[PDB]
Design a protein around this ligand. Sequence first.
Ligand SMILES: */C(=C\C(=O)N1CCC[C@]1(C)C#Cc1cnccc1[C@H]1NC2=C(C(=O)NCC2)[C@@H]1Nc1cccc(Cl)c1OC)CN(C)C
Ligand SMILES: [Cl-]
Ligand SMILES: [Cl-]
Length: 315
Amino acid sequence: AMGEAPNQALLRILKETEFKKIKVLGSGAFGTVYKGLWIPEGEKVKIPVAIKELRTSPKANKEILDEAYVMASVDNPHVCRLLGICLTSTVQLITQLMPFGCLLDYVREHKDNIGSQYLLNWCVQIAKGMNYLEDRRLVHRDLAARNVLVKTPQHVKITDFGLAKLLKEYHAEGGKVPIKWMALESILHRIYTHQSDVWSYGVTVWELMTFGSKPYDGIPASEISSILEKGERLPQPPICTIDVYMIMVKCWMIDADSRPKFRELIIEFSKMARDPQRYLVIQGDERMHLPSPTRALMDEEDMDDVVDADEYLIP
Ligand SMILES: */C(=C\C(=O)N1CCC[C@]1(C)C#Cc1cnccc1[C@H]1NC2=C(C(=O)NCC2)[C@@H]1Nc1cccc(Cl)c1OC)CN(C)C
Ligand SMILES: [Cl-]
Ligand SMILES: [Cl-]
């Protein structure tokens, strides 16, 4: 009779003249991502930003604006926030720059310097961001270590709302979908719920614990549903104690309602984060230390007025 409550999120249209120092950061199936500085006019601030483009066409602009709709409607420290959009021939999305990139690249590049505390804290933070999306009735549908960004080694956020839907279940209609992160009911019946996102969370945690191994490496996507139906799962990572591996296996149960809830994953990983060497066995753990605020990436002329997007709020 009333469906859902009104979505009073604000969508900010940002002037192209407010952006300086645009440089390409990287490209892929997600499109092209640039870095830059957003200098809102009449305000003495310089905000480091990332700008995404689907690498002009009508269908591309509709898809980027659905992602803008979802991201403008989310406000959580562990979820990427849309700062606004820029209306060039192709619509661009503006968000906070995450200078350490994605967690998939990060764990591969720094695998010898990552301790148990960081890994278990990232699990807590990803579960917090996903629990927030569940409170907002959003099913992400593309949770993976490539879609978790690193603001600092101590603070990660979930990104890429290209497949996200506002749901008891959601039913997809074709398109390319990442099979190796999907729950079995999603591969077979296109059923997507917060509990199918829990399965993707399990795979994401396995990616972190294996320092960026490819799930089911060398196995074609077409053979994954058969492997899962036979009861096969991703193997126990060498650093994982049975306590951590059991949590991953619970995420991959056939019965979606038997899987943990994101709020329970926050609790379990938070208890483990209090004594991280009891739960992850890493050769040379806790001597290693990754960077923290307490910004070389910035040019000297910008340093004084630089403000991170997390400290730039608007009424
Ligand atoms: C991931 C690597 C990775 O993402 N990299 C490494 C090279 C630079 C690039 C492409 C980046 C970035 C970046 C930086 N700051 C903030 C956001 C992003 C950004 N990266 C990705 C995003 C995404 O949506 N999909 C996946 C890659 C992402 N998001 C952005 C960017 C701009 C605006 C918006 Cl609103 C936003 O989020 C929607 C490793 N993978 C290649 C495996
Ligand atoms: Cl993929
Ligand atoms: Cl890869």
